[PDB]
Write a protein of this length. Sequence first.
Lengths: 277, 280
Amino acid sequence: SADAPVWIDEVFEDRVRYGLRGQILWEETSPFQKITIVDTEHYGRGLLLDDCWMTAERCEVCYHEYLVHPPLTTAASIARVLVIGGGDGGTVREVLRYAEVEQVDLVEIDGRVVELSQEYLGAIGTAWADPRLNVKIGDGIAFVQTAPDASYDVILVDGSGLFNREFYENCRRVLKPGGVFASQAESPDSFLAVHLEMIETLSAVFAEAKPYYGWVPMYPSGWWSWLYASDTPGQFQKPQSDRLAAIEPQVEIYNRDIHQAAFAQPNFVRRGLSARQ
Amino acid sequence: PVWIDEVFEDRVRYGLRGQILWEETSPFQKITIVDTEHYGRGLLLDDCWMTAERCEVCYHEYLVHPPLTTAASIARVLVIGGGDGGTVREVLRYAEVEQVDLVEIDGRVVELSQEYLGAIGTAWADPRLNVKIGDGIAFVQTAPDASYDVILVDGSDPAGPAAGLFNREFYENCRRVLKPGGVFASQAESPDSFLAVHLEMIETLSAVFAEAKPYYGWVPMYPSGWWSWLYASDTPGQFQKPQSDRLAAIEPQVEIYNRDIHQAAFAQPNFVRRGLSARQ
Ligand SMILES: C[C@H](O)COCC(COC[C@@H](C)O)(COC[C@@H](C)O)COC[C@@H](C)O
Ligand SMILES: CSC[C@H]1O[C@@H](n2cnc3c(N)ncnc32)[C@H](O)[C@@H]1O
């Protein structure tokens, strides 16, 4: 292998590249994808899938805190949480910081991502042994189609077409009253058209769907987004005081002001959405 | 076409496919004008991305609107740096601005930006704009008390011609030069890629001015793409009081910035809040 640290580049559309100098600790192809475990100088250990940046030890909280804490502070209850994806273990770690959470089911199609993340990325996945976590290797899409009505308080998609309308309708069916759906919603910079289409799809399925915005330096443009959906309008703005007071002292980024801030929409998003109303 | 990279401490790189249109070394710095497939025509200084036609509003709207919406008066504005023209374009959107002084050390930056980056610098012809090729640090040392409503520092990283722009004596002269109710703003690097500098800037400016508050936004061509600016003034909380008449004239003319974006950008991550406490 390489004597010294190499440039590990994610190339976007053959015309942008973002790279981190680091060592390859392990690379294999699973039946689903190429998995590359790396040791970066700037961010520590991390993960690519099909030569795209997924995570790293010191650029992960910015993804995981934004996916998890806005839904978990606002859902009427948080006893039962479903994560679709979650392979690196950072989403379930954030979800398990809340004492009210009773069960988290993680459903990840590629068992090699979980094994390799548990073996090398333990500094990100600190909650694998939490007796509330149940890890299932299988298709996340089939799981929500096959799950009971009103069985989960929160549904988090931690992965990325196969997330179509029928999938999101199952999500609404499987959510309990007062419950929250959330997922990544691509870049308003690098994937605007898909960004807007996802907002429109979730707005047609749920009573309210709101995008929110933050930073992932290793994703295309570094300008990333999420989508919150519930069947109560204005729920996204009303985190529970007691959940905020408990979570704020345990996280690196998220607080009551970041929570309100992230939902401010840039004029170009507001305009792209009103063009289609 | 070739990869044009900004390399960040031999650890991180950000590249755009494109072509080199012009390169020279001035008495101050290496100037690179490029065309890029992804963001059109841009500017590197000493191999650091400064600007591009389709990646520039995220920087220029953030530097300019929060101070211009909030200063008690905006008749006289001083811009230090800003050779590419985008900062003064944003400033000159306001009807109540009467004069904008742009003090740029490197005349070649203004000339190459006028020749090649006219699509960013759309306001060079504004009669209210006076371009002065000189050092910003010397300019505010010389300027009289209470002579400007707004000072914007549109400079680069702390290493080379932009270095003195991060020092306490410069910040003291800026607070001296500002009129009552006026506003200072600077780019303040990245809380991901330059956390120690970002927090030192917050601390030094917080000491000089009654209040200084970081604010956060996006610049995909800058290291991490997670960027920041510093608001400072002699009125605590002035950053939360943007004027409705200024917002209603500006919002229709800008791609990102609005009332909600203005208030959101000041939300501080826990690790910035705690990092300022570790500093004490
Ligand atoms: C919100 C922003 O426009 C406020 O202006 C600040 C300010 C108003 O004074 C405060 C008031 C009497 O309690 C004070 O700035 C004082 C600093 C600079 O020491 C300035 O307004 C003064 C103009 C109208 O000359
Ligand atoms: C893309 S524009 C960034 C700008 O900051 C300018 N600059 C850096 N240091 C100073 C200084 N001390 N005085 C005036 N302009 C500066 C650079 O020459 C450039 O136009």
